[PDB]
DNA sequence: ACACCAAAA
DNA sequence: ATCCTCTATCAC
DNA sequence: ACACCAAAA
DNA sequence: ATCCTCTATCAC
DNA sequence: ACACCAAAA
DNA sequence: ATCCTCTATCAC
DNA sequence: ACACCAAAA
DNA sequence: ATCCTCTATCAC
DNA sequence: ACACCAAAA
DNA sequence: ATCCTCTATCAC
């Protein structure tokens, strides 16, 4: 009944072209996964308190307090661009398309391999013998109804290999439980004590304990078996593949010229601000690009390092990414910093556990904010403001030298319109579930695609308990034959895009590579070494200029 | 022919809702069972005499005298709530339904695993090597016709794991044989000897020796085989899910009020007992709730510690459970004490062989009896009884100080009506066979559901004798290759319930949990530890008030 | 029902000093009674 | 009159003023002093008025839950404001007619 | 709320509303137009004003 | 988790904040539940009285 | 009364029945009154508003 | 007035 | 002879 | 008088 | 316009 | 890909 | 053989 | 073996 | 289950 | 679930 | 492939 493959390797990508320039991209992912016995035979409600760090006065923003539930099951997440497309392709799509959208996903497991190891040769030295058990089995299940909490692997760089010819493994399934942690505020050395840094116990009203076994239909897989998913259909909104620029200052009718340049050097002039036509919502009897009326507000002011806290403890508030601006205000316009590692980039020949990191600066210009120049004038507008007639990014709030209006000012509002972030090539997350909150969020910074209806059930896997001749239930803690396994996973991801139209004149930014240089875009980066090592560097999504008005 | 699973894991529970609020509950049980060679290759008629205890004067109530027949076969009992439903569910059903009833059972065996162990490495130390034999087989049989005696596993807390993710094993099949044991009565030290503490030999008229092999159709199971039950239909009576209260004192027409309270403090009054209308069966010319006529007798007086004895030996008489009453008279109103252990509760991290125990106090109030206040007046009723005109729970019978009329009084009779006990969540037995006595018992305290017709055939299992190259039949006692195995068991239990109706005003008792406390109902109890240990505590069945008249 | 671990339910309690004490939703000797607000959403949800 | 305060049960949505704090610029492991405004530092020269009493965390990524109904005394449905631009809900009641 | 981006500075737009007794114009976004003879003006008004 | 509890008392540990994988929108070269990236903001700060 | 009608897939049709005895007496003002309310008695204090 | 923007307007 | 950056309200 | 209590009254 | 604690002798 | 979450997907 | 916490994209 | 490479293989 | 760098001797 | 135990299940 | 100690819910 065995000795015959149950599936087929294929990690291709097809571009099906249709009329009106629509395109049906098809992602093919095949991967070899390894898996060994889950140490805990059961479910463990474990706790984590880093008093070693929480105790310091300034430290809190380093708080790791929580209590997870460790399941003996392992997750199989493929929700990460890096797993489906090939570097070059992402280039192609981005350099050529105008929009992209998720269509359907199809998963498949096969060619199960189960083996047990017997450490023998005690009569000579210390060897290890490998051989497979046929009767042994693996276990699969899919939380299609999504009873279990969502656990995105990119939420930890623990998704699957971005390199096909190299194997990979699964992240173990773990989920949060209810506690109610609490921590007090302190700075550098201050005085007194940390008044109380408590954790807490399980609350009757919010205790939620699930079990793969009481929630899903588990399927047994021996060597000759094989498993396959249904075919999930994505109900999502497409993502544009173009950055913008125009800011409140460049929206529509540029002022009228009265003076025309003489040579390619000197510039031109407008009409007397006093004696100029237009409209404004300030009382002054003149006009200036600065005070002129615009359609709405592009981008907005966000509060810096707004660590807020609830029964859970403290945490930094998330925030809509945006251009960093000349002001190089990163933490100010939510750029993101990733810390991937060798199955997801890294070089490969990089030494030490030190993970490689990358900060992503959003490309939706005209939406960014430069803290420095941001200022609030007063009342009745005055040509040149007094002193106590304008608060700037110098004046301190609540008696702190470096804390300014910026770090607490929130520009958001009705006329505040912006742009949806972009996806990051390798390392980036693809789709995500929606919060079951009667009132939803205009988007997640976590990922590009958010499912409007139900979402892809998570795929769980676990090896089966291979017992010994000895067994007592009431028995303290007991033996089980060593065992581990492998299997291939095959995924199908279909997308839809359309070709961009060329209308400018002046060519336009394209993602390209460069000769052996010190350039960010240097072929060599996406090339093997003499021993065969390579890295995957994030790439620009939305190389081409859009238009917003 | 092997390397392919033969069944599928599923330990779910479905609530199918139908009109008029009827419900079709469906229990799904899957479990991994382990099994090793039966030490006795044959059937053994063994005897058990605990002279070590029977010899003492006071001791008899500790008698364990009998003679069982040990079969090399093992039973597979699933007759225990704890095996089918999930804690929470039992909550749900009880908090929401009004009645429950057995419908059908379906069993299934599959994914057989047979292995032999070879203790080698005699040239180095002392190791153990594991590997499976394919040709080896297992044996199954079902006593559908029920030729063999019934042997409920809950009759010993030896049913199957109540925890799915943890394996389990089978209780070996053993059954009583005929002897005729005898023991004399003695107390603390007395005088003389125990006149005769005999056992006895097999009697021609009642000797009954069966054999799995001459009674059933045994099916051989190799690795790729699989076995499956028919589909038994329960022919039983439903069990209410509500406790009662009303007692003879509160049945119908409360007396007429003549005095009405003034403030929420003081109470009201009735009419002159002498000059009050009604009926009674006492000669007095007055009336009182105590002596008034009621529809029938609710609950009744049972004899305390009525150790009776027959050719078998002595034993305590069983007795219909009932409320314990303020009198806290447990042994008096048959509460029951269970002694479960780690596959059926226990904590888990509890040390030592010490089993955990739990006493169940029945909730059918108004049916209980408080020995203290129970009394018999005399003849011709007298307002306040003399002395030698009323026997109380003080006066001693047959010259013993503590033995009162209670311990020998039996209140039972025509007008004596009561309520069927309730089921106990984990540890509790579900259904049971009926005594083949031409005159049956109004119920069993052993379990809730008693089959009106034939009942579920017991499922027997045994490994097959794996022989060696050496074998002589006439040979004293001989070798057989070490071997053990496993397999999954899947059960299907369907039930029928209906939703309760809300008609009161005043809310009502519901089974709930409580925050991390010292409360009996404290989430934490049904939660894992840091190492993953958990217990199962019995839960209230019939949280809601009924009505009986 | 999908958890394992039972869950918070609105219940009443014997004659106590408890917020949930039958007596509150009961008449007096002269027949007086009050209506105390009750918990809506006793059971744990999930949002992600 | 008898009174009753209703504390909402949508946990994980609440806020503890005490621990809420804003750090500065370029994040620093343990913040200086003039490098973090807390619920101690006073705004506009008033001792007890802190950033909390004027800070508005709301925004695009700000998602929450619809209140719950209160058994006796509670309102059931309600009309909608005839304002060309409506409110994401009324705290006045649970059900708002579309 | 003059805010600024790579473009430069500019006053934030804001939903118009009643000025209130407080006569807070710039505070509740009233708008000031500066039309001219093809769009109003008197006509006999002198100067570019 | 990198450290597993021994008895129902003591807890477990994670990996070095410095040497831990994940993403954040703060410049620091480490990671903590506090600063980690989340799907969106649950609840928000409201102005008192 | 209040009826709980049970249907499949566990849907339920609850039906609320309310009956009540109402009392009513003559409206003192025979007409419509545009009345005013000013609590100077409280508005006058400094802290009070 | 389809023809609501990314599909099957 | 206007439909969301082409032809092409082409998607009717 | 179905209409017998928990199903197919 | 009575059917076993609802509507609903609804289960006919 | 209906099957958009609470109905009549 | 993935549909919003079951069975059951069961609501087609 | 069409199926010959950029169309109408 | 080989057709000119995809799917697709798809262009038959 | 007939299939109710001794007949006409 | 469970029906009252066989085959045989064989008594349908
Ligand atoms: N969907 C579609 N297919 C084909 N031709 C179309 C379609 N819609 C419009 N038209 C025609 C009608 C006009 O002849 C022309 C306009 O462009 O295209
Ligand atoms: N079984 C059943 N199905 C449907 N309608 C019924 C049934 N029995 C009675 N009725 C009708 C007869 C009356 O119109 C009404 C009485 O309740 O319900
Ligand atoms: N609405 C509805 N009624 C009945 N059966 C359905 C319905 N929708 C799907 N199905 C069937 C189709 C499959 O046989 C099964 C899937 O669950 O149920
Ligand atoms: N010209 C053309 N049109 C459509 N389908 C085709 C054509 N030529 C081959 N085929 C089919 C035949 C097979 O089903 C498949 C092979 O690719 O495509
Ligand atoms: N009453 C009766 N007569 C004959 N055959 C029967 C009867 N009842 C069941 N059977 C058949 C049906 C199966 O073929 C077999 C089962 O035993 O017997
Ligand atoms: Ca479902
Ligand atoms: Ca038979
Ligand atoms: Ca046109
Ligand atoms: Ca009626
Ligand atoms: Ca399904
Ligand atoms: Ca081909
Ligand atoms: Ca048979």
Indicate the resolution in Å.
Answer: 3.5
Contact F45, D50 (CB under 8 A): no
> Would you give the end-to-end CA distance of chain G in angstroms?
47
Give every CB contact of residue A70 below 8 A, 6+ residues apart in sequence: A40, A43, A44, A45, A46, A172, A174, B532, F1
What method was applied to determine this entry? X-ray
Smallest CA–CA distance from A213 into chain B, residue: B11
Residue B224: name the closest of A466, A1, A112, A220 by CA.
Answer: A1
Is the Cβ atom of A501 within 7 Å of strand H at any atom? no
Q: Which residues contact B152 (CB under 8 A, 6 or more apart)?
A: B77, B79, B429, B432, B446, B447
The H or E element that residue B138 is part of is: strand B138-143
Using the beta-carbon criterion (under 8 Å), do G8 and B20 form an inter-chain contact?
Answer: no
Tokens in use for B514?
């409580």
Q: How many angstroms is it from B216 CA to the middle of ligand 5?
A: 20
Across all strands, nucleotide nearest B234 (CA–C1'): P1
Are residues D52 and D17 in contact, defined by beta-carbon separation less than 8 angstroms? Answer: yes
Interface touch A207/C44, C-beta < 8 Å: yes
DSSP state letters, A299-327: S----TTEEEEETTEEEEPP------TTT
Asked if G7's CB is within 8 angstroms of B19's CB, the reply is yes
Chain C residues with CB inside 8 Å of A437's CB? 47
Neighbours of ion ligand 6 (CB under 5 A): A 145
Taking the C-alpha atoms of residue B92 and residue B98, their distance in angstroms, rounded to an integer, is 11
Closest residue of chain G to B22, computed from CA coordinates: G6
Give F49 to chain A, closest Cα distance, Å.
18
Closest-approaching ligand to the CA atom of A16: 4
- Residue B140's H or E segment, with its range, is strand B138-143
Using the mean position of ligand 6's atoms as its centre, give its distance from the Cα of residue A145 in Å.
Answer: 5
Nearest-10 Cα torsion for A373, A379, A384, A386: -90
Strand H, CB < 7 A, residues 121-160 of A = none
- Put simply, the answer to whether E10 touches A249 (Cβ < 8 Å) is yes
How far is Cα of residue B69 from the mean position of the Cα atoms in its chain?
23
Whether chain A lies against chain G with 3 or more Cβ pairs closer than 8 A is no
What subunits touch chain F, counting only 3 or more CB pairs under 8 A? A, B, D
Is the separation of the CB atoms in B87 and B536 below 8 Å? yes
> Do the chains contact at A376 and E1, CB–CB below 8 Å?
yes
B92 touches chain C (CB under 8 A): yes
Look up residue A302 and give its two tokens. 């966000």
Across B325-446, the runs of DSSP E, i.e. the strands, are: 336-338, 358-360, 376-377, 390-391, 416-417, 431-432
List all nucleotides in chain M with at least one atom under 7 A from a protein Cβ: 1-11
Terminal-residue alpha carbon distance, chain C: 17
Q: In angstroms, what separates the C-alpha of C33 from chain A's closest C-alpha?
A: 29
- Looking up tokens 């006058």 gives G44
Q: Do D20 and F46 touch (CB under 8 A)?
A: no
Contact assessment for residue A310 and residue D14, using Cβ atoms and an 8 Å cutoff:
yes
Taken in order of first residue, the domains within chain A and their CATH numbers are 1-549 (2.170.30.10)
Question: Is the Cβ of B523 closer than 8 Å to some Cβ of chain F?
Answer: no
- Note the ligand closest to the C-alpha atom of A20: 1
What does the alpha-carbon distance between residue F28 and residue A164 come to, in Å, rounded to a whole number?
32
Beta bridge partners of A242: A544
As a rounded value in angstroms, the CA-to-C1' distance for B105 and K9 is 33
Nearest CA in chain C to D74: C37
Buried-exposed string B29-40: b where 16+ CB fall within 10 A, e elsewhere: bbbbbbbbbbee
**β-pair partners for B75:** B171, B460
Q: Which nucleotides of J are covered by protein (CB under 7 A)?
A: 6-8
Element (H or E) spanning F22, and its range? strand F22-24
Cα B360 from chain centre: 11
CB contact under 8 A, A469 and B36: yes
Distances in whole angstroms, Cα of residue B396 to Cα of each of A174, B58, B373, B391, B404: 66, 21, 15, 9, 5
Spacing of B267 CA from M8 C1' in Å: 58
Residue ranges of the annotated binding site of A are 145
Query: Nearest nucleotide (C1') to the CA of residue B236?
Result: P4
Q: Residue A178: which of A200, A196, A151, A150 has the closest Cα?
A: A200
Please count the other Cβ atoms lying within 10 Å of the Cβ belonging to residue G30: 7
DSSP lists the bridge partners of residue B176 as: B68
CB-CB contact of B335 with B359 (8 Å): yes
- Tokens 């993602």 -> residue: A511
Which nt has its C1' nearest the CA of A235? Answer: L4
> Does D52 touch chain F if contact means CB atoms closer than 8 Å?
yes
Q: Indicate if the alpha-carbon torsion angle D72, D73, D74, D80 is positive or negative.
A: positive
């Amino acid at each position: 009944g065995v000795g015959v493959s149950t599936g087929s390797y294929d990690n291709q990508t097809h571009y099906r072209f249709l009329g009106d320039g629509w395109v049906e991209i098809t992602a093919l992912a095949t991967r070899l996964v390894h898996l060994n016995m889950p140490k805990s035979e059961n479910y463990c409600r474990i706790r984590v308190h880093n008093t070693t760090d929480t105790s310091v006065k300034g430290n809190m923003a380093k708080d790791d307090a929580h209590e997870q539930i460790w399941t003996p099951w392992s997750l199989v997440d493929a929700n990460a661009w890096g797993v489906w497309l090939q570097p070059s392709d992402w280039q192609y799509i981005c350099n050529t398309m105008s929009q992209l959208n998720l269509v359907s996903l199809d998963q498949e497991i096969f060619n199960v391999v189960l083996k047990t190891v017997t450490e023998q040769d005690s009569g000579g030295q210390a060897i290890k013998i490998y051989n497979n058990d046929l009767t042994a089995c693996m276990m699969v299940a899919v939380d299609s109804n999504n009873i279990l909490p969502y656990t995105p692997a990119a939420n930890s760089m623990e998704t699957l290999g971005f390199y096909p010819w190299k194997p990979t493994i699964a992240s173990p399934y773990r989920y949060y439980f209810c506690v109610d942690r609490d921590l007090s505020v302190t700075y550098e050395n201050q005085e007194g004590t940390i008044e109380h840094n408590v954790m807490g116990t399980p609350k009757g009203m919010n205790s939620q304990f699930f079990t793969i076994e009481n929630t899903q239909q588990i399927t047994l897989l021996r060597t000759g078996d094989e498993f396959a998913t249904g075919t999930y259909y994505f109900d999502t909104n497409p993502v544009k593949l173009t950055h913008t620029w125009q800011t409140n200052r460049q929206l529509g009718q540029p002022p009228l010229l009265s003076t025309f340049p003489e040579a390619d050097t000197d510039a031109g002039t407008l009409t007397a601000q006093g004696s100029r036509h237009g409209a404004t919502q300030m009382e002054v009897n003149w006009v200036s690009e600065a005070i002129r009326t615009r359609p709405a507000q592009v981008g907005f002011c966000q509060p810096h390092n707004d660590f807020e806290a609830s029964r859970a403890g403290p945490f930094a508030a998330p925030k809509v990414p945006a251009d960093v601006t000349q002001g190089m205000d990163r933490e100010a316009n939510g750029s993101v910093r990733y810390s991937y590692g060798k199955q997801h980039g890294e070089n490969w020949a990089a030494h030490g556990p030190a993970p490689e990191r990358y900060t992503w600066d959003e490309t939706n210009f005209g939406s960014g904010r430069d803290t420095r120049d941001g200022f609030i004038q007063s009342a009745p507008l005055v040509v040149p403001p007094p002193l106590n007639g304008i608060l700037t990014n110098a004046n301190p709030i609540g008696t702190k030298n470096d804390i300014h209006f910026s770090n607490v000012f929130n520009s958001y509002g009705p006329l505040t319109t912006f742009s949806h972030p972009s996806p990051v090539y390798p390392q980036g997350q693809i789709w995500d579930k929606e919060l079951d909150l009667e009132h939803k969020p205009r988007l997640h910074i976590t990922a590009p695609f958010v499912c409007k209806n139900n979402a892809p059930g998570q795929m769980l896997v676990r090896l089966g308990p291979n017992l010994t001749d000895q067994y007592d239930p009431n028995g303290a803690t007991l033996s089980r034959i060593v065992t581990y396994g492998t299997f291939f996973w095959k995924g199908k991801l279909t997308m839809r895009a359309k070709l961009r139209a060329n209308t400018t004149w002046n060519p336009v930014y394209q993602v390209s590579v460069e000769d052996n240089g010190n350039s960010y875009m240097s072929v060599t980066k996406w090339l093997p070494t003499a021993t065969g090592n390579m890295q995957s560097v994030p790439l620009i999504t939305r190389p081409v200029a859009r238009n917003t008005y």
